[PDB]
Ligand binder design. Structure first.
Ligand SMILES: NC(=O)c1ccc[n+]([C@@H]2O[C@H](COP(=O)([O-])OP(=O)(O)OC[C@H]3O[C@@H](n4cnc5c(N)ncnc54)[C@H](OP(=O)(O)O)[C@@H]3O)[C@@H](O)[C@H]2O)c1
Ligand SMILES: NC(=O)c1ccc[n+]([C@@H]2O[C@H](COP(=O)([O-])OP(=O)(O)OC[C@H]3O[C@@H](n4cnc5c(N)ncnc54)[C@H](OP(=O)(O)O)[C@@H]3O)[C@@H](O)[C@H]2O)c1
Ligand SMILES: CC(C)(O)c1cccn2c(C3(c4ccc(Cl)cc4)CC3)nnc12
Ligand SMILES: CC(C)(O)c1cccn2c(C3(c4ccc(Cl)cc4)CC3)nnc12
Lengths: 265, 262
């Protein structure tokens, strides 16, 4: 139950949206731990800089494959390519998101659809492609979410929708993996305000709250994934840690788990 | 306290109203003397509902058949329904893409179609209905599931869109509160209902007590009319007890102080 950096030594890990912010910080922590890494985002130049520094930090191997997660064909092929480079896969870290600003919802259906496609559907496409390799290694799926993916906030309607969707989908397949004895863990990471450049610019003059450090955030995600934890909670406030968990949800899920006859599947 | 006279002369849209809970809602609204415009894909099933809704005492009853896979249809339907009624007081979003209980393997088409029909069309229908609802200080009623609050196996794609329904509509409710838009949003969290499609879907997979569709449809309407944020409807006493998240509302209240909305 206690974490050690040696747990990630020689592990074959994918980090999406790893050119900046939390994703890059995760690549850096994995490198130091002596893991095999394959990073992705759209910018080739930004990913080149992460691979170079990953090798310097002591990564067992570091590679990149640039491309958009709007392209479900790219998302699918990226996983077959990344597992080929590493000789398999132990951990899939799903972190990328479509660029989003704090705004009231009026009529931007294109932004609602794009948020669902990039923040949620590509995650499903990446999971389908990664599952054969993860089944073989008894691996981990790590889903980076937000507090806006557990509670309601204004100015993020489309973003909150795609984040809530991740919880619904991945919590459902976790229950399916439990009964169909698929030894692949699913870690949902619920994150508060992080001091990344994009987030700090987004909240500027609108939201006034304490920002947690991105370096530590990235580590707590890796920690939970390695410990095969169902959910990881990371925020500045003490109060969030105290009230974010839903004890009644897990109790309800436990009572229903007895009633679902699936010995036909 | 709910009084059926609250729905008398009200201009109401019911999606997925050819059968199940949707049809039961149309029937309750008819008895209450409301103006109704029902939708689904089957013209014949809709015709039978419109006929019986006029018989029950609806102020008016109309139907517009079409698929909610088509965002152009979803947008135009609202405009057409509003023209038929001379406005809109209540938008009941109830339709879902046909879904069976199955383990997820690779059906991305079903994940995408569930998001499009079960969630995106609801957003498209809301955007089209908001000018009319702003004018009438109306209501949006979002029919969801326990599967939109807690996790269940065999319904991954369906759960995703119901969870998304919560995230989206709970977010715009907070936005409407600050931007003083007097349009209520009712999220209806339902258990197993004795509808034909649901009873066939759970057959031999999961047996538990099924709640009556007639009463279910009424509890949704009551919720919407009382402008309640959330409606909970299930058979089990243990579900009503554990389904609510008191800590979520507390957390939302504490964060509301950290932002400026002017
Ligand atoms: N920072 C916070 O305050 C905060 C709060 C709660 C939750 N989180 C969650 O944490 C995760 C990381 O956020 P972050 O703050 O680290 O973000 P960030 O610094 O803005 O980085 C976004 C990453 O995604 C990439 N990306 C953007 N558009 C993409 C697309 N179309 N396809 C593929 N990749 C794309 C970016 O690079 P390219 O543009 O080069 O592709 C970059 O690697 C997200 O899932 C976010 O929701 C963050
Ligand atoms: N019954 C339950 O056990 C249960 C449990 C939890 C939540 N709920 C929620 O309750 C609501 C109603 O469920 P129900 O059991 O009453 O369902 P139902 O009897 O299966 O009815 C579904 C309705 O939607 C229509 N529909 C289907 N596909 C459509 C499409 N592509 N475009 C437009 N309309 C479409 C159907 O008619 P056509 O085929 O003629 O188009 C029908 O009128 C749903 O939101 C469901 O999630 C039900
Ligand atoms: C990653 C992203 C989208 O750039 C981002 C930026 C800034 C804050 N973010 C948040 C929280 C939040 C805080 C306040 C409000 Cl009103 C809405 C949401 C939960 C902290 N989740 N994601 C983000
Ligand atoms: C509307 C639909 C899709 O036909 C439907 C049918 C039957 C039950 N439904 C449920 C619940 C449930 C119960 C058990 C499991 Cl394993 C999954 C989900 C919450 C009751 N939500 N929607 C439905």
């Amino acid at each position: 139950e206690e974490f050690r950096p040696e747990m990630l030594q020689g592990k074959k890990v994918i980090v999406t949206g790893a050119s900046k912010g939390i994703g890059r910080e995760m690549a850096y922590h994995l490198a130091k731990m002596g893991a095999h890494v394959v990073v992705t985002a759209r910018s080739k130049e930004t990913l080149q800089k992460v691979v170079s520094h990953c090798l310097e930090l002591g990564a067992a191997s570091a590679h990149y494959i640039a491309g958009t997660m709007e392209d479900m064909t790219f998302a699918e092929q990226f996983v077959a390519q990344a597992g080929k480079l590493m000789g398999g896969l132990d951990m899939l870290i799903l972190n990328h998101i479509t660029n989003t600003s704090l705004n009231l919802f009026h009529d931007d259906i294109h932004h609602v659809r794009k948020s669902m496609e990039v923040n949620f559907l590509s995650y499903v496409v990446l999971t389908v492609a990664a599952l054969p390799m993860l089944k073989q290694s008894n691996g981990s799926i790590v889903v980076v979410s937000s507090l806006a993916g557990k509670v309601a906030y204004p100015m993020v309607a489309a973003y909150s929708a795609s984040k809530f969707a991740l919880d619904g989908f991945f919590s459902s397949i976790r229950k399916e993996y439990s009964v169909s004895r698929v030894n692949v863990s699913i870690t949902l990471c619920v994150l508060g305000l992080i001091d990344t450049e994009t987030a700090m610019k987004a909240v500027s003059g609108i939201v006034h709250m304490q920002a947690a450090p991105k370096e530590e955030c990235a580590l707590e995600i890796i920690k939970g994934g390695a410990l095969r934890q169902e959910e990881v909670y990371y925020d500045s406030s003490r109060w969030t840690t105290l009230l974010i968990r839903n004890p009644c949800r897990k109790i309800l899920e436990e009572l229903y788990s007895t009633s679902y006859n699936m010995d036909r599947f």
